[PDB]
Design an enzyme around this catalytic site. Sequence first.
Site, PDB file in Angstrom:
ATOM      1  N   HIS A  44       0.807  -1.191   0.000  1.00 48.36           N
ATOM      2  CA  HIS A  44       0.000   0.000   0.000  1.00 48.36           C
ATOM      3  C   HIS A  44       0.872   1.288   0.000  1.00 48.36           C
ATOM      4  O   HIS A  44       1.991   1.305   0.414  1.00 48.36           O
ATOM      5  CB  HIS A  44      -0.770   0.084   1.340  1.00 48.36           C
ATOM      6  CG  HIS A  44      -1.558  -1.113   1.699  1.00 48.36           C
ATOM      7  ND1 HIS A  44      -1.677  -1.521   3.008  1.00 48.36           N
ATOM      8  CD2 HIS A  44      -2.256  -1.993   0.974  1.00 48.36           C
ATOM      9  CE1 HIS A  44      -2.457  -2.591   3.054  1.00 48.36           C
ATOM     10  NE2 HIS A  44      -2.830  -2.903   1.822  1.00 48.36           N
ATOM     11  N   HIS A  46       0.959   4.739   1.829  1.00 48.46           N
ATOM     12  CA  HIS A  46       0.518   5.468   3.016  1.00 48.46           C
ATOM     13  C   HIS A  46       0.737   6.945   2.809  1.00 48.46           C
ATOM     14  O   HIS A  46       1.580   7.332   1.992  1.00 48.46           O
ATOM     15  CB  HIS A  46       1.226   4.904   4.281  1.00 48.46           C
ATOM     16  CG  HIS A  46       0.699   3.564   4.719  1.00 48.46           C
ATOM     17  ND1 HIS A  46       0.220   3.317   5.958  1.00 48.46           N
ATOM     18  CD2 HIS A  46       0.603   2.401   4.071  1.00 48.46           C
ATOM     19  CE1 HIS A  46      -0.176   2.077   6.071  1.00 48.46           C
ATOM     20  NE2 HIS A  46       0.028   1.486   4.917  1.00 48.46           N
ATOM     21  N   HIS A  69     -11.396   1.107   2.668  1.00 44.30           N
ATOM     22  CA  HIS A  69     -10.375   0.219   2.169  1.00 44.30           C
ATOM     23  C   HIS A  69     -10.985  -0.883   1.294  1.00 44.30           C
ATOM     24  O   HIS A  69     -12.048  -1.450   1.627  1.00 44.30           O
ATOM     25  CB  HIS A  69      -9.613  -0.381   3.360  1.00 44.30           C
ATOM     26  CG  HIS A  69      -8.484  -1.291   2.964  1.00 44.30           C
ATOM     27  ND1 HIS A  69      -7.242  -0.829   2.609  1.00 44.30           N
ATOM     28  CD2 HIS A  69      -8.497  -2.631   2.804  1.00 44.30           C
ATOM     29  CE1 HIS A  69      -6.504  -1.902   2.235  1.00 44.30           C
ATOM     30  NE2 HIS A  69      -7.257  -2.991   2.357  1.00 44.30           N
ATOM     31  N   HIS A  78      -9.223   2.803  -1.250  1.00 47.76           N
ATOM     32  CA  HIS A  78      -8.331   3.962  -1.141  1.00 47.76           C
ATOM     33  C   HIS A  78      -7.436   4.030  -2.376  1.00 47.76           C
ATOM     34  O   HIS A  78      -7.080   2.998  -2.969  1.00 47.76           O
ATOM     35  CB  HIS A  78      -7.399   3.789   0.074  1.00 47.76           C
ATOM     36  CG  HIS A  78      -8.122   3.612   1.374  1.00 47.76           C
ATOM     37  ND1 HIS A  78      -7.658   2.754   2.390  1.00 47.76           N
ATOM     38  CD2 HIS A  78      -9.168   4.284   1.875  1.00 47.76           C
ATOM     39  CE1 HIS A  78      -8.441   2.912   3.439  1.00 47.76           C
ATOM     40  NE2 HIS A  78      -9.338   3.829   3.172  1.00 47.76           N
ATOM     41  N   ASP A  81      -4.522   1.646  -2.200  1.00 44.47           N
ATOM     42  CA  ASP A  81      -4.781   0.209  -2.090  1.00 44.47           C
ATOM     43  C   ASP A  81      -4.366  -0.548  -3.328  1.00 44.47           C
ATOM     44  O   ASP A  81      -5.087  -0.658  -4.303  1.00 44.47           O
ATOM     45  CB  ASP A  81      -6.269  -0.008  -1.786  1.00 44.47           C
ATOM     46  CG  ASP A  81      -6.716   0.441  -0.440  1.00 44.47           C
ATOM     47  OD1 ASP A  81      -5.825   0.728   0.412  1.00 44.47           O
ATOM     48  OD2 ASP A  81      -7.941   0.514  -0.162  1.00 44.47           O
ATOM     49  N   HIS A 117       3.573  -5.051   4.038  1.00 49.62           N
ATOM     50  CA  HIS A 117       3.016  -5.506   5.269  1.00 49.62           C
ATOM     51  C   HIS A 117       3.322  -6.944   5.672  1.00 49.62           C
ATOM     52  O   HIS A 117       3.625  -7.794   4.835  1.00 49.62           O
ATOM     53  CB  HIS A 117       1.502  -5.248   5.298  1.00 49.62           C
ATOM     54  CG  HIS A 117       1.074  -3.827   5.431  1.00 49.62           C
ATOM     55  ND1 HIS A 117       0.986  -3.214   6.650  1.00 49.62           N
ATOM     56  CD2 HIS A 117       0.623  -2.920   4.514  1.00 49.62           C
ATOM     57  CE1 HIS A 117       0.552  -1.970   6.487  1.00 49.62           C
ATOM     58  NE2 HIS A 117       0.249  -1.799   5.181  1.00 49.62           N
ATOM     59  N   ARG A 140       4.290  -3.266   9.530  1.00 45.40           N
ATOM     60  CA  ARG A 140       4.963  -2.623   8.414  1.00 45.40           C
ATOM     61  C   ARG A 140       6.407  -3.161   8.390  1.00 45.40           C
ATOM     62  O   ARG A 140       7.234  -2.812   9.245  1.00 45.40           O
ATOM     63  CB  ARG A 140       4.902  -1.115   8.597  1.00 45.40           C
ATOM     64  CG  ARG A 140       3.467  -0.625   8.733  1.00 45.40           C
ATOM     65  CD  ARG A 140       3.420   0.882   9.029  1.00 45.40           C
ATOM     66  NE  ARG A 140       2.040   1.272   9.292  1.00 45.40           N
ATOM     67  CZ  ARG A 140       1.548   2.484   9.282  1.00 45.40           C
ATOM     68  NH1 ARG A 140       2.267   3.555   8.953  1.00 45.40           N
ATOM     69  NH2 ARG A 140       0.225   2.654   9.583  1.00 45.40           N
TER      70      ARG A 140
HETATM   71 CU   LIG Z   1      -1.136  -0.351   4.534  1.00 43.81          CU
HETATM   72 ZN   LIG Z   2      -6.477   1.068   2.271  1.00 40.09          ZN
END
Ligand SMILES: [Cu+2]
Ligand SMILES: [Zn+2]
Lengths: 150, 150
Positions: A44, A46, A69, A78, A81, A117, A140
């Site tokens: 993702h 951020h 999400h 998002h 995503d 992740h 993370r």
């Molecule tokens: Cu994330």
């Molecule tokens: Zn998301």
Amino acid sequence: VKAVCVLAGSGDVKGVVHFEQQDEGAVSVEGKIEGLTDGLHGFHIHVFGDNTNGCMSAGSHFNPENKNHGAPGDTDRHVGDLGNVTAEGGVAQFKITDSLISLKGPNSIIGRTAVVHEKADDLGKGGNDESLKTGNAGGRLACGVIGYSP
Amino acid sequence: VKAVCVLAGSGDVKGVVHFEQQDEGAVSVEGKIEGLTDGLHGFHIHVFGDNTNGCMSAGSHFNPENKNHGAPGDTDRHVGDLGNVTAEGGVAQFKITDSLISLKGPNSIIGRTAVVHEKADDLGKGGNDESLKTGNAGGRLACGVIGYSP
Ligand SMILES: [Cu+2]
Ligand SMILES: [Zn+2]
Ligand SMILES: [Cu+2]
Ligand SMILES: [Zn+2]
């Protein structure tokens, strides 16, 4: 335009991701990440490009269109995503195309953070409130700030 | 708007630099860098946010106007020419302002690289072509990609 990120973290997970866009069209994403356990891992964008507290200071997902999400193919997702990458033999090598992220304009991801992740992203279908925020992707493992490349 | 970068290199030089801009005014730059030899060290914004080959991939100075290298107070300077920082007892702690860089628009430095140099920047007054390109500032001791911060 072209952009790049070098992913690093508190452990041994490291990688490089390249981004390219022509005009205001789709962005091509190509990467290689080493040190991952086998299986799916959430990937993702951020919001913040702040690595002062490691990957924690990157904030939540980049969400300028104010949605929940989801999966990359969903309407309700998002901008940040990008779904899951798959690791085998400790390595994830992937190529994706996405039309919501950009390298210019309001949905620009330049100066933002890419994160890989600990766990798989449940794509918003996990049955709990957290699923609609993060996909239950957990920790993370590595991250980097996205910058311009030659 | 606010931005940050974490500086790292192949040695023991490291630090953090904060940027802030209100309206379209001068950008305030506040930082602390450790591990430096006493005296002057060049501090510039290099064009690319590419740390794939360490600091050596950051490119030359950010220069959209195609000018020569100079002092921050010269009209003939690169947008990325922030002059020198001074180290004492191993540390450079500084607060400067600049009216050419920006955190938005064409001169935005988000996604680009801040670099701290081995030597003093001669401010374009060195008497040779290299002075007019880099200020004779030498190697790149530490660098980092500039990203958005809360
Ligand atoms: Cu994330
Ligand atoms: Zn998301
Ligand atoms: Cu320089
Ligand atoms: Zn210069």
